[PDB]
């Protein structure tokens, strides 16, 4: 447990972008999970990222895509070289050799 | 300045204090005085707090002054689209006919 890291978990409750999802998904379970993974943490603020990412994905499943959560937080979901992470990517992404 | 003179004493007078931010404590010292003055003019104030940063304390302080000053608290601005119908229903319930 560390207060500075604990702020990152509290992002789920305090930040406006996540606050959109409260009517659909209660953040408290994710906050508790985030706190205990910070206890398990072996790094910096990024240890809170799995909880935030899962909360955003749960919200997207329920219907609300939290377009801005990656900018407000310090997190950056891993992507292969050269590709950007983005919410609501269309599955039919355009390859050149595609009709 | 708005309700300086009550030129329609028969008409209901209502304000939506739609609010989404805190204010420094030094600036909140005369808040209760102003809301009570509005009550003495029977100017209804309906606080509509939005977002995590809404000044919930000021909202509850408004609610304590009069029952008709009931508060709406919204997760985000897009919830206004959902709350609009009952908000207008309440506003027109608070207003008399000709």
Report which DSSP code applies to B12: -
Report CB contact under 8 Å: B75, A15. Answer: no
The sign of the dihedral angle between the CA atoms of B24, B30, B36, B38 is negative
Spell out the SS3 assignment of B20-63: CCCCCHHHHCCHHHHHHHHHHCCEEEEEEEECCCCCHHHHHHHH
User: A74 phi and psi, to 5 degrees?
Assistant: -85, 5
Residue from A31, A41, A53 nearest A1 by CA: A41
* CA B33 to mean position of chain CA atoms: 15
Q: How far apart are CA A88 and CA B11, in angstroms?
A: 49
SS3 call for B97: coil
Q: What dihedral angle (degrees, nearest 10) is formed by the CA atoms of B32, B33, B38, B39? A: 70
Radius of gyration of chain B from its Cα atoms, rounded to whole angstroms: 14
Model resolution, angstroms: 3.2
Q: How far apart are CA B22 and CA B19, in angstroms?
A: 9
Output the six-digit token pair for A18: 């996540």
Edge-to-edge strand ranges of the sheet holding B13-19:
B13-19, B43-50, B72-74
Please state, in angstroms and rounded to a whole number, the distance separating the CA atoms of residues A31 and A38. Answer: 10
3-state SS, residue B79: helix
CA atoms within 13 A on the CB side of B48: 18
User: Which residues from A are below 8 Å from B when comparing CB atoms?
Assistant: 13-16, 19-23
CA B49 to chain centre: 9
Separation in Å, CA of B75 to nearest CA in chain A: 6
The values of phi and psi at residue B19, to 5°, are: -145, 140
- Method of determination used here: cryo-EM
Per CB-CB distance under 8 Å, the chain A contacts of B75 are 19-23
Give the burial string for B60-92 (b: 16+ CB within 10 Å, else e): ebbbeeeebbebbebbbeebeeeeeeeeeebee
How far apart CA A38 and CA A34 sit, in angstroms, is 6
Task: Give which of A55, A72, A74 is closest to A16, Cα–Cα.
Answer: A72
Contacts of residue B51 in chain A, CB cutoff 8 Å?
A: 16, 19
């Amino acid at each position: 447990m560390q207060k500075g890291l604990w702020e990152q978990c509290q992002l789920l409750k305090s930040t406006s972008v996540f606050a959109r999802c409260h009517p659909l998904v209660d953040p408290e379970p994710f906050v508790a999970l985030c706190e205990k993974t910070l206890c398990e943490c072996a790094g910096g603020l990024e240890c809170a990222c799995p909880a935030l990412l899962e909360y955003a994905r749960t919200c997207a499943q329920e219907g609300m895509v939290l377009y801005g959560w990656t900018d407000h937080s310090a997190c950056s979901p891993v992507c292969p070289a050269g590709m950007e992470y983005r919410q609501c990517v269309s599955p039919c992404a355009r390859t050149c050799q595609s009709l | 300045q708005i309700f300086s003179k009550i030129d329609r004493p028969e008409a209901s007078r209502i304000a939506l204090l739609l609010m989404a931010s805190q204010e420094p404590q030094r600036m909140s010292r005369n808040f209760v005085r102003y809301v009570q003055g509005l009550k003495k003019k029977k100017v209804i104030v309906i606080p509509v707090g939005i977002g995590p940063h809404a000044n919930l304390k000021q909202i509850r302080l408004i609610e304590k002054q009069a029952p008709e000053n009931k508060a709406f608290v919204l997760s985000s601005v897009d919830e206004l689209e959902q709350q609009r119908d009952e908000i207008v229903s309440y506003l027109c319930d608070l207003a008399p006919e000709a």
